[PDB]
Amino acid sequence: TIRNSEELRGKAIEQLEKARARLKKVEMDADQFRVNGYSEIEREKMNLINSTYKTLEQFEN
Amino acid sequence: LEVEAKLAEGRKKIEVELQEALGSLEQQKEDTIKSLDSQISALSDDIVKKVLP
Numbered sequence: 001t002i003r004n005s006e007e008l009r010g011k012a013i014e015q016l017e018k019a020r021a022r023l024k025k026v027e028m029d030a031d032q033f034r035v036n037g038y039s040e041i042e043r044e045k046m047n048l049i050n051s052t053y054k055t056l057e058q059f060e061n
Numbered sequence: 062l063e064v065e066a067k068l069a070e071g072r073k074k075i076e077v078e079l080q081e082a083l084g085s086l087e088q089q090k091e092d093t094i095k096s097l098d099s100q101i102s103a104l105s106d107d108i109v110k111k112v113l114p
Binding site: 049056 | 063064067068076
């Protein structure tokens with residue numbers, strides 16, 4: 001019983017390290033997601049204003 | 062949201078600039094036709110003699 005109490009302690013601490021490990025992994029993944037979302041918000045109004053200038057040349061010339 | 066509003070504004074601007082350029086080309090064309098009407102008075106002078114073979 002002493003051994004198996006220690007073993008249940010061990011399983012509990014393995015769930016602890018699982019919790020912190022997933023915390024760290026997903027927080028770094030959301031950091032990379034923040035970087036690439038900054039990039040996707042960079043790339044939009046440039047495309048739309050180049051479309052506006054497409055309409056410009058498509059009417060005036 | 063920002064691109065929606067600004068692009069509605071941009072396409073509106075593009076179409077109204079199209080209409081302004083259209084008015085300008087219209088007036089320029091009419092002026093050129095009137096100058097051509099003077100030139101073509103000279104043409105009416107110098108054609109009828111040769112038109113008869």
